[PDB]
Amino acid sequence: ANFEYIIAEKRGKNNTVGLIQLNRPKALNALCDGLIDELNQALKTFEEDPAVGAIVLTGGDKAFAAGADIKEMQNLSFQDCYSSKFLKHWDHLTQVKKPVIAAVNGYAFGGGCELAMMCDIIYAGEKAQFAQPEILIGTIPGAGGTQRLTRAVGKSLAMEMVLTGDRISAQDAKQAGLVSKICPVETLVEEAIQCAEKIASNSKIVVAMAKESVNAAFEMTLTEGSKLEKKLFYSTFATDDRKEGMTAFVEKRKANFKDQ
Amino acid sequence: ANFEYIIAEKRGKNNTVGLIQLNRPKALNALCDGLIDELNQALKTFEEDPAVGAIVLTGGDKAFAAGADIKEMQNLSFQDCYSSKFLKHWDHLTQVKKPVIAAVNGYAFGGGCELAMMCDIIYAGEKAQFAQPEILIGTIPGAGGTQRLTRAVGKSLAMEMVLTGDRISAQDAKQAGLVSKICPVETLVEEAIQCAEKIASNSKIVVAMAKESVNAAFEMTLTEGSKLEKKLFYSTFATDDRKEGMTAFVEKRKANFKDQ
Amino acid sequence: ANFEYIIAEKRGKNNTVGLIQLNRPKALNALCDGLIDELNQALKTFEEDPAVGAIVLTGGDKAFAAGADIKEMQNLSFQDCYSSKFLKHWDHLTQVKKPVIAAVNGYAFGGGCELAMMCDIIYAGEKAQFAQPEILIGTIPGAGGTQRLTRAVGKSLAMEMVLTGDRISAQDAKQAGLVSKICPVETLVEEAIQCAEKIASNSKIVVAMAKESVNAAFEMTLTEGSKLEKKLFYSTFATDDRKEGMTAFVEKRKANFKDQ
Amino acid sequence: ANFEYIIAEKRGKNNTVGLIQLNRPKALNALCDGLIDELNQALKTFEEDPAVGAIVLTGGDKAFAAGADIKEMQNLSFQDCYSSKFLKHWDHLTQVKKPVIAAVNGYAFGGGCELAMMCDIIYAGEKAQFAQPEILIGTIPGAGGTQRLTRAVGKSLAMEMVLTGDRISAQDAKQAGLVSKICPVETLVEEAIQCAEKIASNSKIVVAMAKESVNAAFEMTLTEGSKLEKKLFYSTFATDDRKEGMTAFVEKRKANFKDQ
Amino acid sequence: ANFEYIIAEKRGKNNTVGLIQLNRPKALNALCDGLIDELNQALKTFEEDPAVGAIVLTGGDKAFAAGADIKEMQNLSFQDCYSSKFLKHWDHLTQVKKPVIAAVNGYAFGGGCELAMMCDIIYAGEKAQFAQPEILIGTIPGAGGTQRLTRAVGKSLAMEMVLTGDRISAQDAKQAGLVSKICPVETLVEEAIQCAEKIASNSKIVVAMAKESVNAAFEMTLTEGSKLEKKLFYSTFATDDRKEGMTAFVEKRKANFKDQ
Amino acid sequence: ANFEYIIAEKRGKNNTVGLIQLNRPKALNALCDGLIDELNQALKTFEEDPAVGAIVLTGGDKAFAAGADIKEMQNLSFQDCYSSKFLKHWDHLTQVKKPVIAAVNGYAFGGGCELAMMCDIIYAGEKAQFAQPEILIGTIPGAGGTQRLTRAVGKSLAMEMVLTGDRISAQDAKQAGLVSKICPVETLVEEAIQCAEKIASNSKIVVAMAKESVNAAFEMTLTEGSKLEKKLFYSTFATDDRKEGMTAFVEKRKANFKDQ
Ligand SMILES: [Mg+2]
Ligand SMILES: [Mg+2]
């Protein structure tokens, strides 16, 4: 559909990467309800696209997402927040089966840091900054800003970032484990698109199985996690993609996958 | 009160930071029963102080805490450990609701490293060292020296430090995620006090809710953790400090919080 | 017994370290059925050796283990993999009670990285590389390559390595926490042997208790983990090595341990 | 919309109970795609109805639901099932916030038993029968027929019912804990409607909080469950309904609740 | 310390059973703060008594405990509950190491059922009734009335009792598993005292270990539960009472235990 | 091999049921090392038999298994027990993939009750009794007598049985959920054999998947349990038995399963 807050298009060769770019530069990509609706529409459109195998989520060069709109949430009481479940459409990225690579350039504060952490892979620029300033306005992060952050960077750094609201550099996020790669500002999007192309070049079903196996590490114990990983490695044998890849490996050539 | 092992006072402007400094320099701040009792009393006093919003725990410049007294625990038998629940008052720091910042200077060995890891934020000096030498005397760390350490720095480094008892530098704890900031020895205490002042400047109830949400990341799954975070974010709306902070954000000014 | 794929011997002074060296240099130490059988035989032999306290697992100078044989697993189906529990002998290293130090030199790809992550301590060379290329042949890592990796290095880096199959340097693994020490290619084995000698010098039963307490951090919550740690610290008092070590600490001398 | 497989209406005095009755008597209420879509639509309509406080789900007098259609799932392969998440709309009843009372009359086999167990309260007739015959056609229950059943009736009875497919009487389900009340066949619907009216008479928000607290018992440990229960009990104090109820208890009268 | 709400005495031969009888017959044993304080004092006194090995908690013949005083909690806000942690002294019974047998006669409503479920063994009379009427006053049970209840009687019956507030007979509680034995009203206390005497006649430390092993079933998985059970069965060997009991079993006689 | 403590044979028509009968009537089937070794040998022999689909474990008419040999473990210490892992060969029944039906007749005390609870289905005679008398000799059940028992029969009854050692009748175990069916002592074995034949007639791989899905209910949460159940129900589509059974159901006939 015609979006007014975001820009959705297919990038890279073979058109296998879906680029969802936030286009709110005057508000520093403020996460409003309309922007979230357009983002979810683009996400489901890219998920229902057979040619797309990976999604790249990015905002602006100076700001990825500076948090939710506060004026629409100031006059909310406890009843209207508990009932009606206020930030519920804020977790549709966690239900996406295809990998979503976050290209964080500039400010990723409040809701932006949570939306980035909800993605599988986070690519941060040279001047990218992460913070959780919810404590400054009398609230707490309520979209994964504490659960995923503490699991990623540890208790101490997450406790400091949550209780103080201070910002951390991209280098600190890489050393702590929040992001997996640091790229220049003018080439972050291109490297994220190349990584998404490398991801989508494989079998989509096996990639989804691997993503589920990785995500299960935060929901189950080590023994049950290993058992589920063994069951998934057994189940991946029932696909033609596994046999095709093993044939291309034994008889050295390029593997032609058909997502089945 | 008349303390013989620790020094308790309120530091910083407006006296919002409680400083609990171990005062056993000739014994390398050995964690004895009287010192633990005085630490618990000071923690309770600072918890029951409305003007205190954060606590800073520190020791000496050359040693933070070099472990418990071995003489008072050699004659102890298996039955006398289980019954009297040996080392039962060593986890009172985990029951505090206000944030406690550990300013570790010098040696933090055995019980000292566990007491530091039990704090929310760990500030270490340039010459600070962390180790678990329990394996050297025929015992294992029994106050969180294995659970929290493995969750913070990983399996490999924790296994090495536990089975070998070797010391790690402050830079190692920083790159591994054990500590959150490296500060000079002459200014570590003041930087910890400034961080505790920045923490106490916010709403104490919202800060405690955020601390609980962060601590829940080690006790529940990611889904249930996110559900509890959502419930806490919804409950935050029932406080006057939330509305005050959101109004101060809307009309740009300084938010005056009343801890309610 | 006489091995054809591996080399098993006791190294170090006092013969306290068991060295299991993979001896398949022309196949990059491919994890085959015979190699796994010989590895399990050497592991149980060293476990049934009262003079051995720690095991060092290493491969070649240019490759630790470059994955399993794809030829013996290409013609496998879903039923044959499930009704035979494929790769069920691949986790015998996780049942070892004595510490196992992984001296990873060169390539550790696929099954190699999984076998290395199952060890307690991972020692990597300067030119050591870790990767999970299973996604390139149409399968997923099914021997702990996702559960342990995501817990160690984090969500983002593990997701990238799994979905892309790209390699990471030893420095990246050290920064992310996958390995614990970087050593030269010419001395990595000697450093691992010295670490295993320092480990075996302590009480083997107390060392096993500490290893169990550390491993329990990935199978239980923080509260139950601390409770089990307290119970193990209480049970360690019923050993003769505990009082001997405490007496040697009180009256400064060398503690003579008898593994009881 | 106009339903062809189910009947949706508001029953009972004050029209606070939504009755969703399956209307496929010739197919023993086979769970097809259209019937599931209509059930989800009726559930959403009753959820978005302020005048409805509870839902009652029932079928026919001789059969509640005899499982899904096997014809629409025989020609399905593994890839079509996985890459489309077969039976994904079958768990929309677990996302409902208002209590759903299952009035099971007659046969509740496989999918019917799963849909009944997914409800909060199960009301069964004297001639009601429960079974999981999936093992007879070469499959396993895949909509909670093993997880919830084993947690409700125990390990032994669930194992027997799953591996044998034998039916159990309503008295057996009552003594095992599967159902909570046995009612005559001619009055089961009326008793379920009266129970839902007793439920709908209370505060909807407090009822939803209690439902969440009860459902959390199967998602985490007892300690975290009690902590979440304490937090929800504290959050209840921010509603006007709790104050109104406590005031009506003090000054003995009927409490007028407004769902806020 | 003379009590005004409860009666504390030692009953049974050898004076090994501590009887804590609620003595509020006009208020149906309303759980007030003073009664809770006296109960905690009696509990800690009986725990610190070497002659007492088991505790029996009971109220009146017509009422065990009819819930907390609503007048004390009527004028309480959300901030006053959270901060201050309302009902925080209500879980001191869960920290008792010695077994506590609940002799429930008459009404056990609201806080009474929660206090009874926190006991290890629950003994109910012929006319004993259990209910959770918190939903009738606009609140939810906040002292374990949902977590333990759902784990004991199942999902359906607990959901019904919570959302409706209806009472269940002692027979239904025995069938669902809430209680373990039904006794006449005039002899319930005597049978509970006899059971507590049978319990206290064994080794107190082994009894505490068994209680911990049983309570761990709700805090860990089956694998980790069995592991902790194995570790505790190994740890019980280091006590003299284990060897004494085994000697009395081999050489048939009466075992003389010394709680060590 | 020729057994001296047990009797192993194939019973029932088509020889699809393996009967492992304990043959120690003069010692009340005491669980000794040789008996456990022969039991494990018969179990692995029946597991490696393609014609056997289910195993029936029974003892004598007056005693199923009266616990382990006491004189075999009187002179054992804490170190000898921890380091040798006492009772480790006792959980080989939990690793069996095919269902094991426990035909418990007579006394099932101590280790016998644990071995019975480790089975999937428990069939008890009219005069069968279950108890955990470990507390009477100064020890605790260390082979699943507390974890599985508390999960099956509840907290109160398991606590009573563990702390008192009293016996429960077969009817009590049936109403509590410990056993699934009560049968006469003269026909219990035949009924268990008929049940195993009904189990063995189905697809062995699908039966193993169902057993795994049921056993996973005690190792994971409800959400992850349902996810693993969905994944197993998707994987079962890749078997030939699923399509054969579905075709036999569509066109009504007898399904011919080939265990593939
Ligand atoms: Mg890290
Ligand atoms: Mg039951």
E216 classed as catalytic: no
DSSP states along A89-141: GGGGGGG-SS-EEEEE-SEEETHHHHHHHHSSEEEE-TT-EEE-GGGGGT---
Q: Please give the radius of gyration of chain E, using alpha carbons only, rounded to the nearest integer.
A: 19
Closest ligand to Cα C157: 1
- Homologous superfamily of the B6-200 domain (CATH): 2-enoyl-CoA Hydratase; Chain A, domain 1 (3.90.226.10)
Q: In Å, what is the CA distance from E188 to each residue of E28, E58, E64, E126, F169? A: 18, 10, 12, 9, 21
Q: How far apart are CA D132 and CA B209, in angstroms?
A: 45
Phi-psi category of residue D144: left, alpha or beta, with phi > 0 → left and psi -120 to 50 → alpha: left
**Phi-psi domain of E177 (left: phi exceeds 0; alpha: psi -120 through 50; beta: other):** left
3-class secondary-structure state, position B10: strand
Task: Give the C-alpha separation, E159 to D119, whole Å.
Answer: 10
Cα angle for residues E143, E226, C230 (degrees, 5° grid): 65
**Residues counted in chain F:** 260
Q: How far is CA D15 from the centre of its chain?
A: 20
**Phi, psi dihedrals of residue F96, rounded to the nearest 5°:** -75, 135
Phi, psi of B235 (to 5 degrees): -70, -25
Residue showing tokens 């009487």: D169
> CB-side exposure of D118: number of CA atoms within 13 Å?
22
Q: Which residue has the tokens 């009986």?
A: E46
Catalytic residue among E8, E68, E192, E196: E68
All residues of chain E having their beta carbon less than 8 Å from the beta carbon of residue C231 are 228, 231-232, 235
Locate B44 and state its tokens.
Answer: 């309770």
CA distances from D94 to D43, D83, D212 (A): 11, 22, 11
| Residues A118, A116: Cα–Cα separation, whole Å | 5
C118 Cβ under 8 Å from any chain B Cβ:
no
**B89: helix, strand or coil:** helix
Active-site option among E111, E112, E125, E145: E111
Task: Give D175 Cα–ligand 2 centroid separation in angstroms.
Answer: 7
Distance CA E251, CA F89 (A): 28
CA distance E250 to F66: 15
Task: Calculate the CA D135 to chain-centre distance.
Answer: 23
Q: Both tokens of residue E2?
A: 């003379």
Interatomic CA distance for residues E43 and E100, integer angstroms: 9
- The Cα A155–Cα B217 span in angstroms is 9
The one-letter amino acid at C141: P
Of the listed ligands, the closest to the CA of A172 is 1
Q: For chain D, give the longest Cα–Cα distance.
A: 66
DSSP tally for chain A: helices H, then strands E: 10, 10
Catalytic residue among D111, D112, D144, D145: D111
Q: With an 8 Å Cβ cutoff, are A224 and E221 in contact?
A: yes
Output the 3-class SS for chain F.
Answer: CCCCCEEEEEECHHHCEEEEEECCCCCCCCECHHHHHHHHHHHHHHHCCCCCCEEEEECCCCEEECCECCHHHCCCCHHHHHCCCCCCHHHHHHHCCCCEEEEECCEEECHHHHHHHCCCEEEEECCCEEECHHHHHCCCCCCCCCHHHHHHHCHHHHHHHHHHCCCEEHHHHHHHCCCCEEECCCCHHHHHHHHHHHHHCCCHHHHHHHHHHHHHHHCCCHHHHHHHHHHHHHHHHHCHHHHHHHHHHHCCCCCCCCCC
Domain ranges of chain E: 6-200, 204-250
Ligand closest to the CA atom of residue D177: 2
Residues in chain D: 260
Neighbour-count burial for F52-73, b at 16+ CB within 10 Å, e otherwise: bbbbbbbbbeebbbbbbbeeeb
Ligand-binding site membership of E71 (annotated)? yes
Q: Which residues contact A8 (CB under 8 A, 6 or more apart)?
A: A18, A19, A20, A21, A38, A42, A45, A46
Q: Which chain B positions have a beta carbon within 8 Å of D224's beta carbon?
A: 216, 219-220, 224
Distance of alpha carbon A198 from alpha carbon A178, whole angstroms = 21
Distance from Cα D183 to the centre of ligand 2, integer Å: 20
CA distance F219 to A225: 11
CB atoms within 10 A of CB C74: 16
- The residue of chain E with its CA nearest to that of C225 is E220
CA of F155 to the centre of ligand 2 (A): 11
Going by the DSSP 8-state scheme, the letter that residue E19 receives in this structure is: E
Q: Which chain F residues are within 8 Å of C78, Cβ to Cβ?
A: 235, 238-239
Nearest CA in chain D to E77: D237
- CA F103/CA B192 separation, integer angstroms: 66
Distance from CA of residue F198 to its chain's centroid? Answer: 17
- D96-134 exposure pattern, b = at least 16 Cβ within 10 A, e = fewer: bebbbbbbbbbbbbbbbbbbbbbbbbbbbbeebbbbbbb
- Residue E42 is a catalytic residue: no
Closest CA to C227 of B236, E213, D80: E213
Round to whole Å and give the CA distance between D209 and D236: 8
Residue A231: which of F47, F208, F94 has the closest Cα?
A: F208
Tell me how far CA of residue C31 lies from CA of C38, D150, E156, in angstroms.
11, 40, 51
Q: What is the rounded distance in angstroms from the CA atom of residue D158 to the CA atom of residue F61?
A: 27
For chain D, first and last CA: distance in Å?
30
Measured from the Cβ of residue A124, the count of other Cβ atoms closer than 10 Å reads 29
Resolution of the coordinates, Å:
2.2
The two beta strands, F121-125 and F168-169, are unpaired
Task: For residue E176, give the nearest of D177, D216, D247 by CB distance.
Answer: D177
Residues 6+ apart with CB under 8 A from A14: A51, A197
CB contact under 8 A, E224 and A221: yes
Q: Are E113 and E150 in contact (CB under 8 A)?
A: no
Contact B137 C229 (CB under 8 A): no
Using an 8 Å CB-CB cutoff, list chain E residues near B209: 82
Report the SS3 class of residue E54.
strand
Cβ contact, residue pair A231, F235, below 8 Å: yes
So which residues of C are the catalytic ones? 68, 111, 114, 134
Sheet holding F54-58, edge to edge: F6-11, F17-22, F54-58, F100-104, F121-125, F181-183
Choose among A210, A216, A193: nearest CA to A245.
A210
Among chain A residues, the shortest Cα distance to D241 is held by: A79
Q: Dig out the tokens for C204 from the structure.
A: 């083997």
Secondary-structure percent of chain E, ordered helix, strand, coil, rounded to 5: 50, 15, 35
The catalytic residue among F68, F108, F131, F210 is: F68
Which of C24, C26, C20 has its CA nearest to residue C8?
A: C20
Task: For residue B67, say whether it is annotated as part of any ligand binding site.
Answer: no
Neighbouring CB atoms inside 10 A of D34's CB total 12
CA distance D188 to D193: 9
Beta-carbon contacts of B5 under 8 Å, excluding residues fewer than 6 positions away, are B22, B23, B24, B32, B34, B35, B38, B39
Question: At C143, is the secondary structure helix, strand, or coil?
Answer: coil
The first and second tokens of residue D154, run together, are 């125990």
Collect residues with CB below 5 Å from ion ligand 2. Answer: D 177; E 177; F 177
Q: From CA F125, how far away is CA F104, in angstroms rounded?
A: 6
- Using CB atoms and an 8 Å cut-off, which of residues 161-180 of chain B contact chain E? none
- With an 8 Å Cβ cutoff, is C208 touching chain F? yes
Across-strand partners of D21? D7, D58
Tell how far the Cα of B110 is from the centroid of ligand 1, in angstroms: 22
Phi-psi region of E106 (alpha: psi -120 to 50; beta: other; left: phi over 0): left
Dihedral angle at the C-alpha atoms of C213, C215, C219, C223, nearest 10 degrees? Answer: 30
Q: Which of C230, A174, C222, A168 is nearest to B117 (CA)?
A: C222
Q: Which ligand sits nearest to residue C175's alpha carbon?
A: 1
What separation in angstroms does the CA of F160 have from each of A245, D190, E92, F131, F155? 59, 40, 21, 10, 9
The CATH class of F204-250 is mainly alpha
φ/ψ of residue C60, rounded to 5: -105, 175
Mutation choice for A interface testing from C147, C153, C161, C212 by most A CBs within 10 A: C147
H/E element, A13: none
What is the tally of helices (H) and strands (E) in chain C?
10, 10
Considering every ligand atom shown, identify the ligand nearest to the alpha carbon of residue F155 and give its number. 2
Q: Which burial class, exposed, middle or buried, applies to E138 when counting CB atoms under 10 A from its CB (0-12, 13-18, 19+)? A: buried
CB contact under 8 A, F217 and D74: no
Which residue in A has a C-alpha nearest to residue E220's C-alpha? Answer: A221
Hey, is the C-beta of A78 within 8 angstroms of any chain F C-beta? no
Q: Kindly give, in sequence order, each residue whose CB lies less than 8 Å from that of residue B48, ignoring residues fewer than 6 positions away.
A: none
Greatest alpha-carbon span in chain A: 66
Q: List the chains bordering chain A where 3 or more Cβ pairs fall under 8 Å.
A: B, C, D, E, F
Cβ–Cβ below 8 Å for F239 and C208: no
As a dihedral over the C-alpha atoms of residue A93, residue A94, residue A98, residue A99, rounded to 10 degrees, the angle is: 90
Cβ contact D246:D237 at 8 Å? no
The secondary element (H helix, E strand) that includes residue A252 is none
Residues in chain A closer than 8 A to F234 (CB atoms): 235
Burial of D9 (0-12, 13-18, 19+ CB in 10 A): exposed
Helix, coil or strand: residue D74: helix
The chains in contact with chain F, meaning 3 or more Cβ pairs closer than 8 Å, are A, B, C, D, E
Query: Which chain D residue lies closest to E171 (C-alpha atoms)?
Result: D175
Closest alpha carbon to B101 in B30, B191, B216, B186: B191
User: What is d(CA E187, CA C72) in angstroms, rounded to the nearest whole number?
Assistant: 72
Cα C47 to chain center, whole Å?
Answer: 14
CB contact, 8 Å: D210 with chain B? no
Strand order in the sheet with B100-104: B6-11, B17-22, B54-58, B100-104, B121-125, B181-183
Quick one: tokens of A37?
């609706």
Task: Compute the distance between CA of residue C95 and CA of residue C119 in angstroms, rounded to an integer.
Answer: 10
Which chain C residue shows the shortest CA-CA distance from B178? C177
Upper half-sphere CA count for residue B82 (Cβ side, 13 Å): 25
From chain C, pick out residues whose CB is under 8 angstroms from the CB of E236.
Answer: none
Distances (CA, A) of E173 to B222, D174, E112, E145: 35, 12, 15, 14
What type of residue is B22? L
Which residues in chain E are immediately followed by a break of C to N over 2.5 Å?
none
- Residue B55, chain A, CB below 8 Å: the answer is no
Q: Which residues pair with F65 in a beta bridge?
A: F108
First to last CA, chain B: 30
> Distance between CA F217 and CA A109 in Å, rounded?
40
**Active site annotation includes B68:** yes
Whole-number Å distance, alpha carbon C117 to ligand 1 midpoint, is 15
Q: What span, in angstroms and rounded, lies between the C-alpha atoms of E247 and E245?
A: 5
Exposure of F253 by Cβ count < 10 A (0-12 exposed, 13-18 middle, 19+ buried)?
A: exposed
Residue type, B63: A
Beta strands in D167-229 (DSSP E): 168-169, 181-183
Helix (H, G, I), strand (E, B) or coil at B47: helix
Name the DSSP letter for residue C148: H
**Burial letters C86-123, b for 16+ CB under 10 A, else e:** bbeebebbeebbbbbbbbbbbbbbbbbbbbbbbbbbbb
- Residue indicated by tokens 């905690």: E40
